[PDB]
Design a protein around this ligand. Structure first.
Ligand SMILES: [Cl-]
Ligand SMILES: [Cl-]
Ligand SMILES: [Fe+2]
Ligand SMILES: [Fe+2]
Lengths: 497, 497
C-alpha cells in the first residue's frame, strides 16, 4: 500500500491549518465582556479536519473528516463539546490507524471499497430532534444534538429517493418543510438531479427527477414560495478521467452558468427551464423570493472566474490563489419567459464577499437584511506580513463581517482586527417578537497572534462592537457552515414573522 | 460571596501556564521518528489545572484541580486520553459554575463546607486494577485505568486508618506490598503520623501510629527492607493561624530537618528515632536501602533553604524565585545509634536537580541508576529571553534530564533544546529480562516556540538522542508526578530483578 505518513506535511496542514483532532469537552469557557443572559441555545459548526495524514499529497481542505463543534449557551455561560462524525471513512480508518480513502470524490483511488464515502464535513443542521451532518456526495449522517453521538447514515425512514443530499437544504418558516435535492443523484457522473421535500411530520412530500444539461456541481440552491432554483457551477465531471486517477471536477470555460427553475409543487422533470446566466461561479445563495410581478429575485455570491482554482480546465488554465473575487449579485428570473439567456446581474455592494446569512424567519420570502463575510485588501485591515506565514493554505479567507440593510442601503462592517480572520456567522433573533435582523450575531475568529480561536458575540444595533469575546485555549481549524438552534424553538427552527 | 472572575488573570495562569481544561481524546498522535514497537503500556501523569478561575488572587499552582493524562502505547502508535478527577471540589464547583474552595489546605477560607478537600493533583499510581489519584491532605480517589472514570474517594474496603494518604507510596518489588503513610493523620495541625501497608491481596498489614516532633510537612518518605524513613520539611502548621485566614505552612529557621526511622514490621509508635539532619529542605526521595553494615543509605534531593519560598517564616523572611538549588544528597542513618545529630550529606552530582526516578524493580534495595530533572544556568542551554515572557510562573523549571550510573560515575544529559523545558520522566524496562536501568525514558516537554507539548521517547543506551518525538497539538500545563503501567505486568508493577 502507499506509505502512511505519521505526521502532517504540506501547506494545507501548516500553521493555523494544522489539525488538532481533539474530541471531548471544555466547559465554562473564558469570557471577556458579557454574554447576554437572554441567549439560550446552541451554535453548531462543522470543520474538515483530517483524523489521519492522507497518503494523497496536498489533499484539499474539502476532503477532511467532519468534526462537529457545539457551543451551548445558557444564562451567560457557554460550554464547548467537540466530536467527529462516525462516517464509514472515519471508523474504518480508525480501525486500520491509517488513511484508506483517496482523492476527493474519486473512488478509483481508494485503498478499500467504501459503501459511503462521506466526510460529513460541509454543514450541520437540525431536523426533527437530530443533527444532520451533510456532504453533497452522500446521504446525511444523523447525530444526537446533546452528546454529538453519531446514530449513523440517515435515509428518512427508508424514504430517501436519492444517493445524495445537498449540504444546503432550506427550511420554510411558514410550512415548516425541509426542502432538499441531490445532484449526481444516481452516482458518479450522472446528470440526474432529485428534488425532494419533507413535511414537519417527517413524511416525504415532493419527489421530482430531472436532468442537468451537463454533469456540473450544484453546491447550493434557492427556494421561493412557488419555485426551486438550481444554479450550476461550470465544474464538470468525467468518470473516464476519474478512472485514470484524475480529478472529479474540471472547469469548462465554454459553458454558461446554468440556472434551472422548476415549479415547487406538482411538477415533472420536463417542467424545468435551464436559463443561461453569463459564465461565472455560482457561490452561496443568500435567499430568493418572488416579487410583486411574480419574478424570482435570486441573491447569491457570484464570481467571473473559477473560485475553486485547484480544479482548472482541461489545459490547466485557471486563476491563481487570492485572485478571484465574488460579489453580492441579484439575478432576475421569469419562469414564463422563453428567453433562455439572462442579463448580467446587478450588484448590491462592492465588497469581495461570501457566506451570506439572512434572518431565516423570512427564508423563501422577501428579506431586507443580509449578513456576510468580506475580504478587504485595503492596506492595514489585515497584517498579511504577520498572518500569511502562520496561516497555511487551502481555506478561504475573510477579515470582516458586513450587515446590509436592503431598504436603506446602510452597511455596518465588523473588523475583528489586523491579526484575526473570520468564519461564517450565525444570526440569533433577540427574542420571538424581534423585528427582522434584530438580535445577535456570532462568528468564530482565528487569532493568529495567540494561535487560538475566539467566538465573538455582536449586537445587530452596533455590529462594530464586540459585546463578548469567548476565548478558546485551542485552535478550531477554519471550518464551513454552522447553525443556531434556539432553546425557545421546539422544532429547532425560528417562527415566521 | 467574593466575585467569581470569568477569565484567568495573574502570572500563575499566563502564557504556557494558561489552563486549557479540556477532557476527552486525541487518538493517533503525530510522531516524528519511530516509537519502538515493543513498548506496550500506558504513561499516566497528573497536572494541577484550575477548572474555574479562583476567587483567591495568585492561587498557587499546587491548588489546581487534578487532570489526568494517559498515553496509551501499542505497536508504535499512541493515543491520548485526558480527564479531570471527579473530586468533591470539582463536582460542586461544576454544579455552581464558580470556585468555592479557598486557600491551599485552609478549610476556614472555603465558601461552603467540604467533607473532602482533595484536588487529587499530585500523583497517579496503579494499585490492584485501579488508578489512585493522590493528594497528601486526603484519601486517594480511585479511577478506571482504561476510561479515566472516577469511581470515588477510596478507603481500601473500609480499612484505611488515616484521614490522609501520602502522594508518594512505595511499591516493594519483592513482597508486592504498597507501603504508605499519612501525616496530619487526625486532622489539621495534628502531629500524628499513621504508617500503614497493604499486601498484594489488598489486606492491610502494618498500622503504626507515631508522633512527629513538630507538625511539619512530610511530602515524601523512604522504605528499605527493614525500615521506613520520614524526612520532615521545616514547614510547620499552626491551626490558629489558619483560623484567622493565614497560610497552612510557615517556614521555621530554628529547627533541623528531622528524619524519623521506624522498624518496618512489628513496631510501636515509640520505636521511632527522630534523627536531626542539618537544617534544609527535604526534596523527593530517589530511593533508600540498607548496605552490608545494616546502615540506611538515603538518597534524595536536598536544599539548604526554603524551596517553597511563597510560604516564608513568621517575619516574611525567605529566598527569592530561582535562588534555591537542590542537590542529589546521600544521608547515612543507623537505627542503633543513639546520636541524634547527623553529619552533612555527601553529594552524588553537582547539578541543580529534582524529580529523581529509579528502576523500580530495585526499589527499597541497592540501586545503581538514577534519572532526574536538572536546571542548568550555563549560558545558552535555555534561551531565557524568549522563554520567560511566555512561561508564566508558579511552577518549577527543568531544562534537561540526567542519567547517573552510580558504579561508573558516568552522567548522560538530555537537553531537549533552548526553547523547551521538561517535566518528571518515567523509566520503562526494555523487557522483562532487561538489566537495571536498561530500556526507555519518556518525558513531557513544553515547547515555548510552538506553545505546544511534546512527549519525547529516549533509549537509555544514548539518552542524548530522541528516538521519537510525539507532537501534541495542545498544551499540557506543567504537571507533577506520573507512572508507567506496562501491559506485560499483571498487577501493573514490574517484576523484581
Ligand atoms: Cl458515536
Ligand atoms: Cl467520572
Ligand atoms: Fe457550502
Ligand atoms: Fe511530589
Amino acid at each position: 500500500l502507499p506509505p502512511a505518513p505519521r505526521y502532517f506535511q504540506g501547506e494545507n496542514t501548516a500553521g493555523f491549518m494544522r489539525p488538532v483532532r481533539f474530541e471531548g469537552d471544555i466547559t465554562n469557557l473564558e469570557v471577556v465582556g458579557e454574554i447576554p443572559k437572554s441567549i439560550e441555545g446552541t451554535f453548531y459548526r462543522v470543520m474538515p479536519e483530517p483524523h489521519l495524514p492522507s497518503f494523497i499529497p496536498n489533499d484539499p481542505w474539502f476532503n477532511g473528516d467532519g468534526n462537529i463543534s457545539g457551543f451551548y449557551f445558557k444564562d451567560g455561560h457557554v460550554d464547548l463539546k467537540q466530536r467527529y462524525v462516525r462516517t464509514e471513512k472515519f471508523v474504518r480508518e480508525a480501525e486500520a490507524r491509517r488513511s484508506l480513502l483517496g482523492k476527493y470524490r474519486n473512488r478509483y483511488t481508494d485503498l478499500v471499497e467504501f459503501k459511503i464515502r462521506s466526510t460529513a464535513n460541509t454543514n450541520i443542521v437540525y431536523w426533527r430532534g437530530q443533527l444532520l451532518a451533510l456532504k453533497e456526495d452522500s446521504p446525511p449522517y444523523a447525530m444526537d444534538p446533546e452528546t454529538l453521538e453519531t446514530f449513523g447514515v440517515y435515509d428518512f425512514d427508508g424514504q430517501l429517493p436519492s444517493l445524495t443530499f445537498t449540504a444546503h437544504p432550506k427550511f420554510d418558516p411558514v410550512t415548516r418543510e425541509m426542502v432538499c435535492f441531490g445532484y449526481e443523484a444516481k452516482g458518479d457522473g450522472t446528470r440526474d438531479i432529485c428534488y425532494y421535500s419533507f413535511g414537519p411530520d417527517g413524511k416525504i412530500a415532493e419527489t421530482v427527477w430531472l436532468v442537468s444539461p451537463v454533469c456540473g456541481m450544484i453546491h447550493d440552491f434557492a427556494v421561493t414560495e412557488n419555485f426551486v432554483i438550481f444554479p450550476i457551477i461550470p465544474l464538470v465531471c468525467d468518470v473516464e478521467r476519474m478512472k485514470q486517477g484524475g480529478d472529479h471536477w474540471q472547469w469548462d470555460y465554454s459553458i454558461p452558468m446554468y440556472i434551472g427553475v422548476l415549479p415547487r409543487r406538482g411538477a415533472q422533470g420536463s417542467d424545468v427551464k435551464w436559463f443561461e446566466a453569463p459564465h461565472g461561479f455560482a457561490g452561496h445563495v443568500a435567499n430568493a423570493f418572488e416579487d410583486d410581478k411574480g419574478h424570482i429575485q435570486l441573491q447569491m455570491a457570484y464570481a467571473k472566474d473559477n473560485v475553486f482554482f485547484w480544479w482548472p480546465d482541461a489545459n490547466g488554465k485557471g486563476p491563481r490563489p487570492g485572485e478571484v473575487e465574488a460579489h453580492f449579485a441579484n439575478f432576475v428570473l421569469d419562469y414564463q419567459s422563453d428567453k433562455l439567456p439572462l442579463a448580467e446581474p446587478t450588484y448590491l455592494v462592492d465588497d469581495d464577499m461570501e457566506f451570506p446569512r439572512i434572518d431565516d424567519r423570512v427564508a423563501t420570502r422577501k428579506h431586507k437584511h443580509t449578513f456576510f463575510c468580506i475580504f478587504d485588501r485595503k492596506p492595514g485591515v489585515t497584517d498579511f506580513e504577520f498572518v500569511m506565514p502562520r496561516a497555511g493554505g487551502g481555506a478561504p479567507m475573510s477579515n470582516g463581517l458586513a450587515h446590509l440593510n436592503h431598504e436603506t442601503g446602510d452597511i455596518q462592517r465588523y473588523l475583528p482586527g489586523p491579526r484575526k480572520l473570520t468564519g461564517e456567522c450565525i444570526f440569533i433573533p433577540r427574542n420571538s417578537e424581534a423585528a427582522e435582523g434584530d438580535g445577535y450575531v456570532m462568528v468564530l475568529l482565528a487569532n493568529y497572534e495567540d494561535m487560538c480561536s475566539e467566538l465573538a458575540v455582536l449586537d445587530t444595533k452596533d455590529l462594530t462592537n464586540e459585546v463578548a469575546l469567548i476565548k478558546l485555549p485551542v485552535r478550531l481549524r477554519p471550518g464551513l457552515h454552522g447553525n443556531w438552534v434556539d432553546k425557545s424553538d421546539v422544532d429547532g427552527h425560528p417562527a415566521p414573522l
